Amino acid sequence: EGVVHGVATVAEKTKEQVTNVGGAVVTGVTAVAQKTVEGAGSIAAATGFVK
Amino acid sequence: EGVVHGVATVAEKTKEQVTNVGGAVVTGVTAVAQKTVEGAGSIAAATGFVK
Amino acid sequence: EGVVHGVATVAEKTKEQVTNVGGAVVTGVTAVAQKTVEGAGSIAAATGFVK
Amino acid sequence: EGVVHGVATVAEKTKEQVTNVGGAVVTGVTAVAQKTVEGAGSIAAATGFVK
Amino acid sequence: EGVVHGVATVAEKTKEQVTNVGGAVVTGVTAVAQKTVEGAGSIAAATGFVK
Amino acid sequence: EGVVHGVATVAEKTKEQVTNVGGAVVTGVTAVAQKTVEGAGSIAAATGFVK
Structure with missing residues (x-):
């Protein structure tokens, strides 16, 4: 349960779970x-960054 | 349950789950x-970035 | 349940789930x-970025 | 010039030359x-072999 | 010039030359x-071998 | 010049030369x-061998 600004993630017997905010x-x-x-x-092999 | 600004993600026995906000x-x-x-x-091999 | 600005995602026994906001x-x-x-x-091999 | 069993390869100012016998x-x-x-x-990613 | 069994390779100002016998x-x-x-x-990523 | 069994390789101002016999x-x-x-x-990442 949330009260203020936020993200909730629910799951059951899964094989992948991630919540980057x-x-x-990178997985x-x-x-x-x-x-x-x-x-x-140049950025030759960036592979998943933020800028 | 949410109260303020936010995203909710629900699932059951899945094989992939991710909520990037x-x-x-990258998976x-x-x-x-x-x-x-x-x-x-140049950006030769960006592969999933933000700018 | 949502109260303020937001996206909800519901599922049951699925094989793919993601809510990028x-x-x-990239999956x-x-x-x-x-x-x-x-x-x-040039951007030779962008492969799913934002700019 | 050849005298016995063999292969000859001649070229002038080219951009690719190879004689595998x-x-x-792989180039x-x-x-x-x-x-x-x-x-x-299985042979998943053979990519140019001999067997 | 060859006298017996063999391969000859001639070139002039080229950008690639190889004679595997x-x-x-791999180049x-x-x-x-x-x-x-x-x-x-299995042979997952053979990438140019002999067997 | 060759007299007996053998391979000859000639070149001039090139950028790659190799004669594996x-x-x-691997280059x-x-x-x-x-x-x-x-x-x-298994042979997972062979990458150019002989057997």
């Missing part, structure tokens, strides 16, 4: 693989 | 694979 | 594969 | 990306 | 990315 | 990334 959660997989990646200001 | 959750897979990627300001 | 959730798969990708300001 | 050369790119891949004896 | 050369890129890969005897 | 040379990149990979006898 402003950050950046899957990733296999970035590059080569000769030039460029000023 | 402003961030960036799947990804296989970015590049080569000779030039370009100033 | 402003971020960027599927992806296999970007490029080669010789020039271009200033 | 029984092995397995391109690949972005295999799977999920829940069962199966006895 | 029974092994397995490109690869981004295998799997999840929950069962299976006895 | 039975081993296994590219690779980003294998797995999760929960069962299986007796």
Whole structure:
């Protein structure tokens, strides 16, 4: 039960549960693989960030 | 039950559950694979970010 | 039950559930594969972001 | 010039040259990306082999 | 010039040259990315081998 | 110049040159990334071998 500003998450016998409320959660997989990646200001393999 | 501004999520015996309320959750897979990627300001393999 | 501004999500024995309310959730798969990708300001393999 | 059993390869100012005579050369790119891949004896992401 | 059994490779100002005569050369890129890969005897991410 | 059984490789101002004659040379990149990979006898991330 909530009284003020907020998010509630309910579940039963699940296989995945996450409630990010402003950050950046990473739970899957990733296999970035590059080569000769030039460029000023680049973000080559960001993979789930906030800015 | 909510009283003020907020999101509620209910489930029962599920296989995936997530409520991002402003961030960036990543849970799947990804296989970015590049080569000779030039370009100033580029974002080569963003893969689920916020800006 | 909600009292103020908000979204409600109800389910029972499902296989996928997510309520993003402003971020960027990624749960599927992806296999970007490029080669010789020039271009200033490019976003080569965005794959589900917000800007 | 050849005298006995063999292969000859001639070129001038090219951008790709390879003569595999029984092995397995790999020079391109690949972005295999799977999920829940069962199966006895499987070869999920072979990507250019010999058997 | 060859006298006996063999392979000859000639080039001039090229960008790729390789002559594997029974092994397995790998020169490109690869981004295998799997999840929950069962299976006895499997070869999940072979990526250019000989057997 | 060759006199007996053998392979010759000639080049001029190139960017890649290799002649494996039975081993296994690796020169590219690779980003294998797995999760929960069962299986007796498996070879999960072979990445360019001989057997």
